[PDB]
Structures are given as C-alpha cells and as structure tokens.
Subunit: 134 residues, 2 copies
Amino acid sequence: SKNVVIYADGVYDMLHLGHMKQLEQAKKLFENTTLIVGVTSDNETKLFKGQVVQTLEERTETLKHIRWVDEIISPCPWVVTPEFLEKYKIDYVAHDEDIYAWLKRAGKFKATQRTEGVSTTDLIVRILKNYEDY
Amino acid sequence: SKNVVIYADGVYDMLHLGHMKQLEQAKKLFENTTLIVGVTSDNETKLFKGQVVQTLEERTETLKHIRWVDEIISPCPWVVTPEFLEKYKIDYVAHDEDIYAWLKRAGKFKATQRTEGVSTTDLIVRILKNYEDY
C-alpha cells in the first residue's frame, strides 16, 4: 500500500521506554509509513510547558538511535499549522479550547497512548528505595 | 560484501546515549552486519559486577527499540565461549589475566569505545545542581 507520512512531536527529555512505545505506535499506524519526529526547542519548552534537563541537541541526538524514527525536525514549531503539514507533506499527526480540533476536523488526528511508570525519573525513585527512612 | 555477524554483550541498565553509540559502532564495524546483543542476567550481574536497577525483561525491552540491534540473546551467558560463537555463527565480538586473549588470538575481537558524561545518572546530577547548597 501507499506510503503514509506521520508526524509526532514532543520534548523527548530523558528518553525512556514510554517515549519509545509511543513512537512505535505512531510508526505502526499504517502498513507503510514515514515517521517524522519533531523535537521542541529549549526556550519554547521552558516558557510554555516546563523544565527540561537535556538540550535540544542532546534530545535530538538520542532520538536518532530509535528504530521507529525516520526523519527528525529539530527544532520543530511549537504549534502545528496547516501550512506546516502542507510543507512536509504530512498525512496524519499522531499524539496522545481544543487547539487540535482543526486536525480532527481535517481527518489528520491519530491518537496514541502514554505508558505510566516507565519514566527515567521513575527509575531514580526505585534506586532510592534501597535506603530505608530509618 | 558478505554479511558479518557481530556480538556485543552487556548489562544495558538505564539505557543511555553512551550505550547507543557503542551499539552503533559495533553495528558499523563492517558494511553489512547482523548485530546480536547479549543482555546479562539479573543474578549473574549482581553477583559478579554490581547493582542493577532494571530487570532483565526491562533492559531487554528497551534495547528492542534501538535501531542498530538486529537480534537479542536474553539472557546471555556471563562468559563467552568458543562454542557459543560457533552456535550462533558469530564472526566477531565487539566491546570496549586477559580473559579475552583467546578472542584476540582467534581474530574475533573488535574494540569499541565508551562515551563519558552521557549516562542516565549524569543527568540526575545535572537536575540536582539547580538546588544551591546554600
């Protein structure tokens, strides 16, 4: 079947299994896909969302090693526009008032899911529990 | 050119960029390769090497998402033997008195390098420095 261009964006700070499973899900939405991953800039992420440990260059370099990632746009725009989708010939946007209503209206919204309890910060908590409060 | 089977093993706890670059280097030792990655068991790692945060299943599941990894042996043997290399038709073993002298003697040892300062635990230290001692 025809190749389908999928776009997923995010911060991808401290990349963990949860991110990887979400990228896998986006890559597998159709039989033959090109998965483009957008990595948000350092300044926009901190201004609008919150703190980031790794720089754009670090977060991008790590994603390059993930088998589902076909292309990376780094930095990506903070807000997806219809002209952005036109410019990169994106067929669907994958991700987890409604600022995405236009995407759904256009038939280009594909839902993916988050995995709880697999984050990098979750592992640090596990390490700490070897140390009894008393 | 002919396909070359490469074997790299390790713990791969809290997989980070350093691991990923080492896997990439092993995968790229020749033009056409099959990279087999061995993931050490939980009990042998703790007995002989030291503490592990993630279980075998977790460490293995994460490696499955790395683009350089063609096959995984999980758990792998703690000590590589000549019969192991025969059994999986391994051409070279890649990794960073000399218990590996027989590998070098056989022409099957390929060196790879470690990256300093990119580990998961290094990121936690960076987080903590936002908090002044005083």
